[PDB]
Protein backbone atom coordinates (compact mmCIF):
# COMPACT_ATOMS: atom_id res chain seq x y z
CA UNK A 1 0.00 0.00 0.00
CA UNK A 2 1.26 3.49 -0.71
CA UNK A 3 3.01 5.48 1.92
CA UNK A 4 0.69 7.88 3.70
CA UNK A 5 0.30 9.21 7.20
CA UNK A 6 -1.44 7.52 10.12
CA UNK A 7 -4.65 9.25 11.22
CA UNK A 8 -3.90 12.38 13.25
CA UNK A 9 -5.81 12.50 16.51
CA UNK A 10 -7.59 15.67 17.55
CA UNK A 11 -6.07 17.19 20.66
CA UNK A 12 -7.96 17.92 23.83
CA UNK A 13 -7.02 21.54 23.78
CA UNK A 14 -8.78 21.72 27.08
CA UNK A 15 -6.16 19.42 28.65
CA UNK A 16 -3.47 22.14 28.53
CA UNK A 17 -4.74 25.76 28.42
CA UNK A 18 -7.64 24.70 30.72
CA UNK A 19 -8.97 28.26 30.06
CA UNK A 20 -9.23 27.56 26.27
CA UNK A 21 -11.71 30.00 24.64
CA UNK A 22 -11.77 28.09 21.32
CA UNK A 23 -9.84 30.55 19.13
CA UNK A 24 -6.17 29.43 19.18
CA UNK A 25 -3.96 26.91 21.02
CA UNK A 26 -1.45 29.21 22.78
CA UNK A 27 -3.23 31.01 25.64
CA UNK A 28 -2.45 34.74 25.14
CA UNK A 29 -3.60 34.74 21.47
CA UNK A 30 -6.73 32.94 22.82
CA UNK A 31 -7.50 35.67 25.37
CA UNK A 32 -6.72 38.52 22.99
CA UNK A 33 -8.86 36.89 20.27
CA UNK A 34 -11.93 36.88 22.53
CA UNK A 35 -11.26 40.15 24.36
CA UNK A 36 -11.43 41.74 20.89
CA UNK A 37 -14.30 39.61 19.51
CA UNK A 38 -16.80 39.95 22.36
CA UNK A 39 -15.91 43.64 22.35
CA UNK A 40 -16.06 44.48 18.64
CA UNK A 41 -18.75 41.83 18.27
CA UNK A 42 -21.18 42.60 21.07
CA UNK A 43 -19.95 45.68 22.85
CA UNK A 44 -19.87 48.17 19.94
CA UNK A 45 -22.02 46.63 17.19
CA UNK A 46 -25.02 45.15 18.96
CA UNK A 47 -25.03 48.19 21.28
CA UNK A 48 -23.80 51.18 19.30
CA UNK A 49 -25.42 49.75 16.18
CA UNK A 50 -28.81 49.24 17.80
CA UNK A 51 -28.47 52.70 19.36
CA UNK A 52 -27.88 54.29 15.91
CA UNK A 53 -30.52 52.14 14.12
CA UNK A 54 -33.08 52.97 16.84
CA UNK A 55 -32.40 56.69 16.34
CA UNK A 56 -32.71 56.66 12.52
CA UNK A 57 -35.47 59.32 12.30
CA UNK A 58 -38.85 58.78 10.58
CA UNK A 59 -37.44 55.83 8.57
CA UNK A 60 -39.01 55.70 5.06
CA UNK A 61 -41.25 58.66 5.98
CA UNK A 62 -43.74 56.77 8.11
CA UNK A 63 -43.32 59.25 10.97
CA UNK A 64 -44.04 62.09 8.52
CA UNK A 65 -47.13 60.49 7.02
CA UNK A 66 -48.99 60.11 10.31
CA UNK A 67 -48.99 63.92 10.59
CA UNK A 68 -49.57 64.84 6.94
CA UNK A 69 -52.63 62.60 7.18
CA UNK A 70 -53.69 64.42 10.32
CA UNK A 71 -53.53 67.87 8.69
CA UNK A 72 -55.06 66.57 5.44
CA UNK A 73 -57.80 64.81 7.52
CA UNK A 74 -57.95 68.02 9.60
CA UNK A 75 -58.17 70.16 6.41
CA UNK A 76 -60.36 67.85 4.29
CA UNK A 77 -62.96 67.21 7.03
CA UNK A 78 -63.36 70.87 8.16
CA UNK A 79 -63.60 72.19 4.55
CA UNK A 80 -66.03 69.34 3.73
CA UNK A 81 -63.89 67.74 0.98
CA UNK A 82 -64.01 63.90 0.67
CA UNK A 83 -61.28 62.42 2.94
CA UNK A 84 -59.93 60.22 0.12
CA UNK A 85 -61.45 61.33 -3.13
CA UNK A 86 -62.10 58.49 -5.43
CA UNK A 87 -59.85 59.44 -8.40
CA UNK A 88 -56.35 60.60 -7.80
CA UNK A 89 -55.04 61.87 -11.08
CA UNK A 90 -57.74 64.47 -11.78
CA UNK A 91 -60.18 63.41 -14.55
CA UNK A 92 -59.65 66.80 -16.28
CA UNK A 93 -55.91 66.09 -16.82
CA UNK A 94 -56.68 62.72 -18.50
CA UNK A 95 -57.27 62.80 -22.27
CA UNK A 96 -59.40 59.73 -22.90
CA UNK A 97 -59.67 58.13 -26.34
CA UNK A 98 -62.79 58.29 -28.48
Amino acid sequence: QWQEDPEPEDENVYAKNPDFHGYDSDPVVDVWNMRAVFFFGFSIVLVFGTTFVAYVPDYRMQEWARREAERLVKYREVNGLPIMESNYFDPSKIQLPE
Partner: protein, 459 residues
Protein backbone atom coordinates in the same frame (compact mmCIF):
# COMPACT_ATOMS: atom_id res chain seq x y z
CA UNK B 1 -21.23 52.57 -1.09
CA UNK B 2 -17.54 52.27 -1.26
CA UNK B 3 -16.98 52.11 2.51
CA UNK B 4 -18.85 48.99 2.75
CA UNK B 5 -16.67 47.91 -0.17
CA UNK B 6 -13.27 49.57 -0.21
CA UNK B 7 -12.59 48.96 3.40
CA UNK B 8 -13.60 45.39 2.59
CA UNK B 9 -11.07 45.02 -0.16
CA UNK B 10 -8.44 46.23 2.20
CA UNK B 11 -9.25 43.24 4.37
CA UNK B 12 -7.46 41.15 1.79
CA UNK B 13 -4.24 43.04 2.21
CA UNK B 14 -4.62 42.59 6.00
CA UNK B 15 -5.15 38.82 5.85
CA UNK B 16 -2.00 38.47 3.83
CA UNK B 17 0.34 41.09 5.34
CA UNK B 18 -0.63 40.32 8.99
CA UNK B 19 1.24 37.92 11.32
CA UNK B 20 0.29 34.19 11.08
CA UNK B 21 -0.66 34.19 14.79
CA UNK B 22 -2.56 37.54 14.65
CA UNK B 23 -4.14 37.07 11.18
CA UNK B 24 -7.48 35.81 12.62
CA UNK B 25 -8.17 38.66 15.08
CA UNK B 26 -7.20 41.50 12.73
CA UNK B 27 -9.60 40.14 10.10
CA UNK B 28 -12.55 39.30 12.40
CA UNK B 29 -12.29 42.46 14.52
CA UNK B 30 -12.09 44.75 11.47
CA UNK B 31 -15.06 43.29 9.54
CA UNK B 32 -17.24 43.60 12.70
CA UNK B 33 -16.57 47.37 12.30
CA UNK B 34 -17.03 46.98 8.50
CA UNK B 35 -20.57 45.81 9.44
CA UNK B 36 -20.97 48.96 11.61
CA UNK B 37 -20.21 51.20 8.57
CA UNK B 38 -22.74 49.04 6.65
CA UNK B 39 -25.43 50.08 9.18
CA UNK B 40 -25.24 53.71 7.88
CA UNK B 41 -27.14 52.68 4.69
CA UNK B 42 -30.18 51.94 6.94
CA UNK B 43 -30.58 55.73 7.51
CA UNK B 44 -33.33 56.33 4.95
CA UNK B 45 -35.41 59.21 6.26
CA UNK B 46 -37.20 59.44 2.92
CA UNK B 47 -38.62 57.14 0.29
CA UNK B 48 -36.21 57.99 -2.52
CA UNK B 49 -33.79 55.11 -3.14
CA UNK B 50 -30.26 56.12 -2.22
CA UNK B 51 -28.40 56.14 -5.57
CA UNK B 52 -24.85 56.47 -4.16
CA UNK B 53 -23.40 56.82 -7.70
CA UNK B 54 -23.86 55.71 -11.29
CA UNK B 55 -22.97 52.02 -10.77
CA UNK B 56 -23.69 51.67 -7.02
CA UNK B 57 -27.21 51.86 -5.47
CA UNK B 58 -29.07 50.69 -2.33
CA UNK B 59 -32.82 50.48 -2.01
CA UNK B 60 -34.95 49.00 0.67
CA UNK B 61 -34.51 45.47 -0.78
CA UNK B 62 -30.75 45.49 -1.02
CA UNK B 63 -29.99 47.31 2.20
CA UNK B 64 -31.31 44.66 4.51
CA UNK B 65 -29.03 42.19 2.79
CA UNK B 66 -25.79 44.17 2.30
CA UNK B 67 -25.79 44.46 6.14
CA UNK B 68 -26.34 40.66 6.50
CA UNK B 69 -23.59 39.97 3.91
CA UNK B 70 -21.16 42.19 5.87
CA UNK B 71 -22.36 40.65 9.20
CA UNK B 72 -21.74 36.99 8.27
CA UNK B 73 -18.10 37.52 7.14
CA UNK B 74 -17.18 38.11 10.76
CA UNK B 75 -19.19 35.07 11.76
CA UNK B 76 -17.96 32.92 8.94
CA UNK B 77 -14.42 33.66 9.96
CA UNK B 78 -15.25 32.68 13.52
CA UNK B 79 -16.89 29.42 12.67
CA UNK B 80 -14.03 28.23 10.58
CA UNK B 81 -11.23 28.99 12.96
CA UNK B 82 -11.32 25.47 14.23
CA UNK B 83 -11.25 23.35 11.17
CA UNK B 84 -8.82 25.39 9.09
CA UNK B 85 -6.67 25.73 12.16
CA UNK B 86 -4.92 22.60 11.16
CA UNK B 87 -3.65 24.25 7.95
CA UNK B 88 -0.17 25.54 6.81
CA UNK B 89 -0.54 29.29 7.39
CA UNK B 90 -1.03 29.98 3.72
CA UNK B 91 -4.03 27.83 3.33
CA UNK B 92 -5.67 29.78 6.05
CA UNK B 93 -4.89 33.16 4.57
CA UNK B 94 -6.40 31.82 1.35
CA UNK B 95 -9.63 30.65 3.08
CA UNK B 96 -9.95 33.96 4.99
CA UNK B 97 -9.46 35.92 1.72
CA UNK B 98 -11.93 33.66 -0.13
CA UNK B 99 -14.56 34.43 2.56
CA UNK B 100 -13.64 38.16 2.31
CA UNK B 101 -14.13 38.24 -1.50
CA UNK B 102 -17.57 36.57 -1.24
CA UNK B 103 -19.07 39.55 0.67
CA UNK B 104 -17.05 42.09 -1.39
CA UNK B 105 -18.65 40.46 -4.47
CA UNK B 106 -22.01 39.79 -2.73
CA UNK B 107 -22.15 43.34 -1.22
CA UNK B 108 -21.66 44.73 -4.77
CA UNK B 109 -24.14 42.29 -6.40
CA UNK B 110 -26.86 43.26 -3.88
CA UNK B 111 -25.77 46.92 -4.34
CA UNK B 112 -25.64 47.02 -8.17
CA UNK B 113 -27.71 49.28 -10.47
CA UNK B 114 -26.88 47.62 -13.82
CA UNK B 115 -28.48 44.17 -14.13
CA UNK B 116 -25.47 42.73 -16.05
CA UNK B 117 -23.18 44.08 -13.29
CA UNK B 118 -25.41 41.75 -11.25
CA UNK B 119 -24.74 38.96 -13.78
CA UNK B 120 -20.93 39.35 -13.89
CA UNK B 121 -20.71 39.69 -10.06
CA UNK B 122 -23.66 37.23 -9.68
CA UNK B 123 -21.86 34.36 -11.45
CA UNK B 124 -18.42 35.32 -10.08
CA UNK B 125 -19.58 34.39 -6.53
CA UNK B 126 -19.43 30.75 -7.77
CA UNK B 127 -15.60 30.94 -8.08
CA UNK B 128 -15.02 31.76 -4.37
CA UNK B 129 -17.79 29.33 -3.29
CA UNK B 130 -16.61 26.38 -5.45
CA UNK B 131 -13.06 26.79 -4.05
CA UNK B 132 -14.41 26.86 -0.44
CA UNK B 133 -16.53 23.71 -1.08
CA UNK B 134 -14.07 21.69 -3.25
CA UNK B 135 -10.68 22.65 -1.79
CA UNK B 136 -11.54 22.24 1.90
CA UNK B 137 -14.50 19.81 1.56
CA UNK B 138 -14.11 16.86 3.97
CA UNK B 139 -16.02 14.14 2.01
CA UNK B 140 -14.85 12.20 -1.11
CA UNK B 141 -17.87 13.60 -3.02
CA UNK B 142 -17.19 17.37 -3.01
CA UNK B 143 -15.61 17.15 -6.46
CA UNK B 144 -19.03 15.92 -7.55
CA UNK B 145 -20.90 18.49 -5.41
CA UNK B 146 -18.76 21.28 -6.90
CA UNK B 147 -19.61 20.10 -10.44
CA UNK B 148 -23.35 20.13 -9.60
CA UNK B 149 -23.08 23.64 -8.07
CA UNK B 150 -21.20 25.01 -11.12
CA UNK B 151 -23.24 23.43 -13.94
CA UNK B 152 -26.77 23.99 -12.60
CA UNK B 153 -25.97 27.70 -12.04
CA UNK B 154 -23.94 28.01 -15.28
CA UNK B 155 -26.52 26.42 -17.64
CA UNK B 156 -29.12 28.77 -16.13
CA UNK B 157 -26.66 31.71 -16.33
CA UNK B 158 -25.96 31.80 -20.10
CA UNK B 159 -29.72 32.15 -20.95
CA UNK B 160 -29.89 35.21 -18.62
CA UNK B 161 -26.76 36.60 -20.32
CA UNK B 162 -28.54 36.34 -23.71
CA UNK B 163 -31.78 37.78 -22.25
CA UNK B 164 -30.20 40.86 -20.61
CA UNK B 165 -28.14 41.73 -23.73
CA UNK B 166 -31.48 41.20 -25.54
CA UNK B 167 -33.40 43.75 -23.42
CA UNK B 168 -30.53 46.24 -23.75
CA UNK B 169 -31.06 46.18 -27.51
CA UNK B 170 -34.87 46.26 -27.05
CA UNK B 171 -34.85 49.10 -24.44
CA UNK B 172 -31.31 50.56 -24.68
CA UNK B 173 -29.84 50.33 -21.14
CA UNK B 174 -29.83 47.68 -18.36
CA UNK B 175 -30.01 50.36 -15.63
CA UNK B 176 -32.50 49.21 -13.04
CA UNK B 177 -33.60 52.77 -12.34
CA UNK B 178 -34.51 53.54 -15.93
CA UNK B 179 -35.80 50.15 -16.80
CA UNK B 180 -38.30 50.80 -14.02
CA UNK B 181 -39.36 54.25 -15.21
CA UNK B 182 -39.59 53.12 -18.83
CA UNK B 183 -42.28 51.27 -20.72
CA UNK B 184 -41.16 47.68 -21.08
CA UNK B 185 -44.28 45.61 -21.52
CA UNK B 186 -43.77 42.18 -23.02
CA UNK B 187 -46.39 41.14 -25.57
CA UNK B 188 -47.36 37.60 -24.60
CA UNK B 189 -45.93 36.08 -27.73
CA UNK B 190 -44.47 32.64 -27.77
CA UNK B 191 -41.05 34.17 -27.83
CA UNK B 192 -41.60 36.47 -24.90
CA UNK B 193 -42.98 33.50 -23.05
CA UNK B 194 -39.44 32.28 -23.56
CA UNK B 195 -37.66 35.55 -22.59
CA UNK B 196 -39.49 35.50 -19.22
CA UNK B 197 -38.29 31.92 -18.63
CA UNK B 198 -34.75 32.88 -19.67
CA UNK B 199 -34.55 35.74 -17.13
CA UNK B 200 -36.26 33.93 -14.22
CA UNK B 201 -34.71 30.45 -14.73
CA UNK B 202 -31.16 31.42 -13.74
CA UNK B 203 -32.51 33.08 -10.55
CA UNK B 204 -34.93 30.13 -9.96
CA UNK B 205 -32.00 27.65 -10.09
CA UNK B 206 -29.82 29.12 -7.26
CA UNK B 207 -33.10 29.73 -5.36
CA UNK B 208 -33.67 25.96 -5.29
CA UNK B 209 -37.04 25.31 -7.02
CA UNK B 210 -38.51 21.80 -6.54
CA UNK B 211 -37.36 20.74 -10.04
CA UNK B 212 -33.69 21.87 -9.83
CA UNK B 213 -32.85 21.84 -6.07
CA UNK B 214 -30.72 18.65 -5.96
CA UNK B 215 -27.61 20.88 -6.21
CA UNK B 216 -28.22 22.43 -2.72
CA UNK B 217 -28.55 19.19 -0.65
CA UNK B 218 -25.37 17.80 -2.29
CA UNK B 219 -23.44 21.10 -1.97
CA UNK B 220 -24.11 21.85 1.73
CA UNK B 221 -23.49 18.21 2.75
CA UNK B 222 -19.71 18.18 1.95
CA UNK B 223 -19.18 22.00 1.98
CA UNK B 224 -17.20 23.30 5.01
CA UNK B 225 -19.29 25.17 7.64
CA UNK B 226 -18.33 28.61 6.25
CA UNK B 227 -19.40 27.59 2.72
CA UNK B 228 -22.70 26.11 3.99
CA UNK B 229 -23.43 29.32 5.96
CA UNK B 230 -22.66 31.43 2.85
CA UNK B 231 -24.79 29.23 0.55
CA UNK B 232 -27.83 29.24 2.86
CA UNK B 233 -27.63 32.81 4.21
CA UNK B 234 -26.45 34.91 1.22
CA UNK B 235 -25.88 32.72 -1.88
CA UNK B 236 -29.44 31.32 -2.30
CA UNK B 237 -30.96 34.79 -1.61
CA UNK B 238 -28.97 36.13 -4.62
CA UNK B 239 -31.59 34.31 -6.70
CA UNK B 240 -34.47 36.00 -4.84
CA UNK B 241 -32.90 39.49 -5.10
CA UNK B 242 -32.55 38.88 -8.83
CA UNK B 243 -36.19 37.87 -9.24
CA UNK B 244 -37.39 41.05 -7.49
CA UNK B 245 -35.36 43.44 -9.69
CA UNK B 246 -35.77 41.55 -13.02
CA UNK B 247 -39.58 41.16 -12.98
CA UNK B 248 -39.91 45.00 -13.07
CA UNK B 249 -39.65 44.24 -16.82
CA UNK B 250 -41.54 41.17 -18.20
CA UNK B 251 -44.46 42.79 -16.28
CA UNK B 252 -47.43 41.21 -18.24
CA UNK B 253 -46.28 37.56 -18.76
CA UNK B 254 -45.78 36.50 -15.11
CA UNK B 255 -49.56 36.95 -14.57
CA UNK B 256 -49.99 33.68 -16.56
CA UNK B 257 -46.41 32.32 -17.00
CA UNK B 258 -45.97 31.79 -13.24
CA UNK B 259 -48.56 28.99 -12.62
CA UNK B 260 -45.99 26.29 -13.58
CA UNK B 261 -43.42 27.46 -10.97
CA UNK B 262 -46.00 28.40 -8.28
CA UNK B 263 -47.44 24.86 -8.32
CA UNK B 264 -43.93 23.35 -8.61
CA UNK B 265 -42.95 25.35 -5.49
CA UNK B 266 -46.03 24.73 -3.29
CA UNK B 267 -46.13 20.95 -3.98
CA UNK B 268 -42.33 21.10 -3.75
CA UNK B 269 -42.68 22.83 -0.37
CA UNK B 270 -44.65 19.81 0.95
CA UNK B 271 -42.35 17.08 -0.42
CA UNK B 272 -39.09 18.87 0.50
CA UNK B 273 -40.54 19.54 3.99
CA UNK B 274 -41.55 15.88 4.32
CA UNK B 275 -38.28 14.16 3.29
CA UNK B 276 -36.67 16.27 6.07
CA UNK B 277 -38.92 14.06 8.28
CA UNK B 278 -36.77 10.94 7.64
CA UNK B 279 -33.24 12.01 6.54
CA UNK B 280 -30.36 10.62 8.71
CA UNK B 281 -27.80 13.42 7.97
CA UNK B 282 -28.59 16.57 10.02
CA UNK B 283 -26.94 18.84 7.43
CA UNK B 284 -29.12 17.06 4.89
CA UNK B 285 -32.31 17.91 6.86
CA UNK B 286 -31.39 21.62 7.31
CA UNK B 287 -30.68 21.82 3.54
CA UNK B 288 -34.13 20.47 2.57
CA UNK B 289 -35.63 22.74 5.27
CA UNK B 290 -33.84 25.49 3.31
CA UNK B 291 -35.34 24.27 0.00
CA UNK B 292 -38.91 24.25 1.41
CA UNK B 293 -38.66 27.64 3.16
CA UNK B 294 -37.22 29.00 -0.04
CA UNK B 295 -39.95 27.41 -2.06
CA UNK B 296 -42.29 29.65 -0.22
CA UNK B 297 -40.29 32.63 -1.38
CA UNK B 298 -40.47 31.81 -5.11
CA UNK B 299 -44.17 31.57 -4.56
CA UNK B 300 -44.38 35.06 -3.29
CA UNK B 301 -42.02 36.68 -5.73
CA UNK B 302 -44.36 35.34 -8.37
CA UNK B 303 -47.77 36.05 -6.96
CA UNK B 304 -46.39 39.59 -6.82
CA UNK B 305 -48.65 41.22 -4.26
CA UNK B 306 -47.24 43.89 -1.98
CA UNK B 307 -47.50 41.63 0.99
CA UNK B 308 -45.84 38.71 -0.74
CA UNK B 309 -42.81 40.76 -1.58
CA UNK B 310 -42.13 41.94 1.96
CA UNK B 311 -43.23 38.58 3.36
CA UNK B 312 -40.43 37.40 1.07
CA UNK B 313 -38.01 40.13 2.25
CA UNK B 314 -38.88 39.36 5.90
CA UNK B 315 -38.46 35.56 5.48
CA UNK B 316 -35.28 35.72 3.35
CA UNK B 317 -33.35 37.83 5.91
CA UNK B 318 -34.89 35.86 8.81
CA UNK B 319 -34.44 32.35 7.35
CA UNK B 320 -30.91 33.33 6.29
CA UNK B 321 -29.97 34.07 9.91
CA UNK B 322 -31.88 31.01 11.25
CA UNK B 323 -30.43 28.54 8.70
CA UNK B 324 -26.86 29.54 9.38
CA UNK B 325 -27.56 29.22 13.10
CA UNK B 326 -28.76 25.66 12.39
CA UNK B 327 -25.80 24.90 10.06
CA UNK B 328 -23.38 26.40 12.63
CA UNK B 329 -24.64 24.25 15.56
CA UNK B 330 -24.81 21.18 13.27
CA UNK B 331 -21.06 21.73 12.69
CA UNK B 332 -20.35 21.95 16.42
CA UNK B 333 -21.97 18.51 16.87
CA UNK B 334 -20.14 17.25 13.74
CA UNK B 335 -16.68 18.25 15.00
CA UNK B 336 -17.01 16.50 18.37
CA UNK B 337 -19.12 13.58 17.06
CA UNK B 338 -17.04 13.31 13.79
CA UNK B 339 -20.18 12.02 11.99
CA UNK B 340 -23.15 13.83 10.36
CA UNK B 341 -25.57 11.04 11.45
CA UNK B 342 -28.59 12.39 13.40
CA UNK B 343 -29.23 9.11 15.31
CA UNK B 344 -25.82 9.18 17.10
CA UNK B 345 -25.27 11.99 19.66
CA UNK B 346 -28.51 11.66 21.58
CA UNK B 347 -28.99 13.54 24.79
CA UNK B 348 -26.57 16.32 24.36
CA UNK B 349 -28.47 18.77 26.67
CA UNK B 350 -27.38 16.46 29.36
CA UNK B 351 -23.79 17.30 28.51
CA UNK B 352 -23.93 20.62 26.67
CA UNK B 353 -26.56 22.55 28.55
CA UNK B 354 -26.48 25.91 26.72
CA UNK B 355 -25.84 24.87 23.10
CA UNK B 356 -29.21 23.13 23.65
CA UNK B 357 -30.88 26.48 24.49
CA UNK B 358 -29.42 27.83 21.22
CA UNK B 359 -30.70 24.65 19.50
CA UNK B 360 -34.19 25.24 20.98
CA UNK B 361 -34.38 28.92 19.90
CA UNK B 362 -33.02 28.04 16.42
CA UNK B 363 -35.74 25.38 16.01
CA UNK B 364 -38.48 27.75 17.24
CA UNK B 365 -37.17 30.25 14.62
CA UNK B 366 -37.19 27.32 12.12
CA UNK B 367 -40.87 26.58 12.84
CA UNK B 368 -43.12 29.65 12.99
CA UNK B 369 -43.30 30.65 16.70
CA UNK B 370 -45.18 34.03 16.63
CA UNK B 371 -43.09 36.90 18.17
CA UNK B 372 -40.47 36.17 15.46
CA UNK B 373 -39.93 37.79 12.02
CA UNK B 374 -39.85 34.21 10.68
CA UNK B 375 -43.58 33.86 11.46
CA UNK B 376 -44.50 37.34 10.25
CA UNK B 377 -42.93 36.38 7.01
CA UNK B 378 -44.83 33.19 6.50
CA UNK B 379 -48.02 34.70 7.76
CA UNK B 380 -47.81 37.21 4.98
CA UNK B 381 -46.86 34.97 2.15
CA UNK B 382 -49.65 32.74 3.42
CA UNK B 383 -52.12 35.54 3.20
CA UNK B 384 -51.36 36.52 -0.34
CA UNK B 385 -51.16 32.91 -1.54
CA UNK B 386 -54.67 32.56 -0.01
CA UNK B 387 -55.71 35.65 -2.04
CA UNK B 388 -54.30 34.05 -5.23
CA UNK B 389 -56.54 31.01 -4.54
CA UNK B 390 -58.23 30.17 -1.20
CA UNK B 391 -57.23 26.51 -1.81
CA UNK B 392 -53.51 27.37 -1.41
CA UNK B 393 -53.92 27.16 2.41
CA UNK B 394 -54.28 23.34 2.07
CA UNK B 395 -50.76 22.93 0.58
CA UNK B 396 -49.26 25.83 2.63
CA UNK B 397 -51.15 24.09 5.44
CA UNK B 398 -49.58 20.66 5.06
CA UNK B 399 -46.13 22.39 5.06
CA UNK B 400 -46.77 24.17 8.41
CA UNK B 401 -47.70 20.85 10.12
CA UNK B 402 -44.66 19.06 8.58
CA UNK B 403 -42.34 22.02 9.38
CA UNK B 404 -43.30 21.75 13.04
CA UNK B 405 -42.58 18.02 13.01
CA UNK B 406 -39.04 18.04 11.52
CA UNK B 407 -37.93 21.17 13.42
CA UNK B 408 -38.76 19.54 16.80
CA UNK B 409 -37.46 16.10 15.69
CA UNK B 410 -34.05 17.74 15.18
CA UNK B 411 -34.29 18.91 18.84
CA UNK B 412 -35.86 15.64 20.10
CA UNK B 413 -33.36 13.11 18.63
CA UNK B 414 -30.24 15.35 18.76
CA UNK B 415 -30.72 17.35 21.97
CA UNK B 416 -32.84 15.05 24.20
CA UNK B 417 -33.24 11.34 25.10
CA UNK B 418 -30.59 9.33 26.93
CA UNK B 419 -26.97 10.29 26.38
CA UNK B 420 -24.93 8.31 23.92
CA UNK B 421 -22.93 5.84 25.99
CA UNK B 422 -19.42 6.64 25.04
CA UNK B 423 -18.76 8.29 21.88
CA UNK B 424 -15.40 9.95 21.93
CA UNK B 425 -16.02 11.96 25.00
CA UNK B 426 -17.49 15.27 24.00
CA UNK B 427 -15.26 18.10 25.08
CA UNK B 428 -17.07 21.05 26.56
CA UNK B 429 -18.23 24.01 24.46
CA UNK B 430 -15.81 26.64 23.37
CA UNK B 431 -16.82 30.24 23.87
CA UNK B 432 -16.39 30.78 20.17
CA UNK B 433 -18.95 28.20 19.34
CA UNK B 434 -21.43 29.74 21.65
CA UNK B 435 -20.77 33.30 20.49
CA UNK B 436 -20.95 32.34 16.84
CA UNK B 437 -24.43 31.30 17.79
CA UNK B 438 -25.22 34.23 20.04
CA UNK B 439 -24.08 36.51 17.17
CA UNK B 440 -26.69 34.81 14.93
CA UNK B 441 -29.67 34.95 17.40
CA UNK B 442 -29.09 38.30 19.21
CA UNK B 443 -29.66 40.03 15.79
CA UNK B 444 -32.72 37.77 15.23
CA UNK B 445 -34.14 39.01 18.58
CA UNK B 446 -33.28 42.68 17.77
CA UNK B 447 -34.74 42.63 14.21
CA UNK B 448 -38.00 41.06 15.53
CA UNK B 449 -38.44 44.16 17.77
CA UNK B 450 -38.65 46.50 14.72
CA UNK B 451 -39.61 44.48 11.59
CA UNK B 452 -39.98 47.65 9.45
CA UNK B 453 -36.28 47.72 8.40
CA UNK B 454 -36.36 44.34 6.56
CA UNK B 455 -39.89 44.84 5.12
CA UNK B 456 -39.17 45.13 1.47
CA UNK B 457 -39.61 47.50 -1.38
CA UNK B 458 -43.35 47.10 -1.40
CA UNK B 459 -43.95 48.36 2.09
Amino acid sequence: MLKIILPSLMLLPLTWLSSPKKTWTNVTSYSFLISLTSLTLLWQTDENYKNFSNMFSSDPLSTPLIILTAWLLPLMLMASQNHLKKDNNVLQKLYISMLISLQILLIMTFSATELIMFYILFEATLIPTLIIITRWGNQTERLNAGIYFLFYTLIGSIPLLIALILIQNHVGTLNLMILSFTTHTLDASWSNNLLWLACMMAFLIKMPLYGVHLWLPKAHVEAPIAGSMILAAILLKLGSYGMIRISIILDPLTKYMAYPFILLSLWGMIMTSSICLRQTDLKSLIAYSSVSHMALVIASIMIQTPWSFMGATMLMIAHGLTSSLLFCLANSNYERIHSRTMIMARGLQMVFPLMATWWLMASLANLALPPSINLMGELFITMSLFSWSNFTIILMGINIIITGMYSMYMIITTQRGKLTNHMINLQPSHTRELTLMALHMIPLILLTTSPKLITGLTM
